[PDB]
Amino acid sequence: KSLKGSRTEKNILTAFAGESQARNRYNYFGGQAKKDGFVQISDIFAETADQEREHAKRLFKFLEGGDLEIVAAFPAGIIADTHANLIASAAGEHHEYTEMYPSFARIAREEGYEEIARVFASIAVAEEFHEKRFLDFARNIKEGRVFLREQATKWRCRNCGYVHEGTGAPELCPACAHPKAHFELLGINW
Ligand SMILES: [Fe+3]
Ligand SMILES: [Fe+3]
Ligand SMILES: [Zn+2]
């Protein structure tokens, strides 16, 4: 049925507004991460931003036109050091998957919008993993484990693919001469 005049219609626009702002914030944090010398984290912020663009797109497509007023609170700033930005981002994701989306989903089910409710719930799953990544990286920075580990492992240069074996990433990639910032733990998800 039509969304016109329902609380769900307003919730969809509210989520869209928030997701849109999240996309921008994450891209800015991505740029800051690059400046702070964390390439993997920078690319993670950028990817998360792109995924927020997609959450927003799915939501936007449910709407049926017209201007709708909304009342909501949003983060008024700010861009800080990468550790701080990761913490703030995780907090945002936390609110979204623990409070906002579940509430919106329940109301959607209440008003008889099962498909939309399912989408809200599904997006919440994505946000929980978004938070996990942000919290994990924040922890790595705080513990000084971004580029150094207890036991020898494999590190990959994101710039050229060089693989380094050792307890930590090298100061300079021997293959492309780019700085340590480009290294990440070698991952194999296939
Ligand atoms: Fe997210
Ligand atoms: Fe390299
Ligand atoms: Zn999202």
Q: Domain residue spans in the chain?
A: 1-145, 146-190
Q: Is the peptide bond before 87 cis (omega within 30 degrees of 0)?
A: no
Q: From ligand 1's centre to the CA of 98, what distance in Å?
A: 12
CA–CA distance, 131 with 185 (Å, rounded to integer): 20
Q: How many Å lie between the centroid of ligand 2 and the Cα of residue 170?
A: 10
- Name the experiment that determined this structure: X-ray
Closest residue by Cα to residue 21 from 68, 78, 69, 98? 78
| Residue 8 exposed, middle or buried by CB count within 10 Å (0-12, 13-18, 19+) | buried
9 is in an annotated binding site: no
Residue 185: which of 172, 158, 177, 175 has the closest Cα? 158
Residue pair 138/90 in contact by the 8 Å Cβ criterion: yes
Q: Which residues contact 49 (CB under 8 A, 6 or more apart)?
A: 22, 23, 24, 26, 27, 30
Task: In whole angstroms, give the CA distance from residue 113 to residue 101.
Answer: 14
Q: Is 52 annotated as a binding residue?
A: yes
CB-based contact 158:40 (threshold 8 Å) = yes
Question: Candidates 3.20.20.70, 3.30.450.20, 2.20.28.10, 1.10.10.10; correct CATH number of 146-190?
Answer: 2.20.28.10
Angle at Cα 154 formed by Cα 33 and Cα 142, nearest 5°?
A: 40
What is the separation, in whole angstroms, between the first and last Cα of the chain? Answer: 42
Main-chain phi, psi angles of 3, to 5 degrees: -90, -20
Q: How far is CA 140 from the centre of its chain?
A: 17
**93 is annotated as contributing to ligand binding:** yes
DSSP label of 179: B
CB 167 within 8 Å of CB 148: yes
Q: What is the C-alpha to C-alpha distance for residues 59 and 56, in angstroms, rounded to an integer?
A: 5
Domains 1-145 and 146-190 share a fold: no
Half-sphere exposure of 44 (CA within 13 A, CB side): 22
Q: Burial letters for 35-74: b for 16+ Cβ neighbours within 10 Å, e otherwise?
A: ebebbbbbebbbebbebbeebbebbeebeeeeeeeeeeee
173 is in an annotated binding site: yes
Q: Which secondary structure element, helix H or strand E, spans residue 26, and what is its range?
A: helix 7-35
Q: At what angle do helices 39-60 and 114-142 cross, to 10 degrees?
A: 170
Ligand of minimum distance to the alpha carbon of 158? 2
Out of 1.20.1260.10, 3.10.20.30, 3.90.1150.10, 3.30.300.160, which CATH number does the structure's domain 1-145 have? 1.20.1260.10
> Is residue 57 within 8 Å of 49, Cβ to Cβ?
no
Rg, C-alpha atoms of the chain? 20
133: CB partners within 8 A, 6+ apart: 44, 48
96 is in an annotated binding site: yes
DSSP class of residue 62? T
User: Which residues fall within 8 angstroms of residue 16, CB to CB, at 6 or more apart?
Assistant: 56, 59, 60, 63
Q: How far does the centroid of ligand 3 lie from the alpha carbon of residue 16, in Å?
A: 9
Q: Comparing C-alpha atoms, which of 172, 176, 171 is closest to residue 160?
A: 176
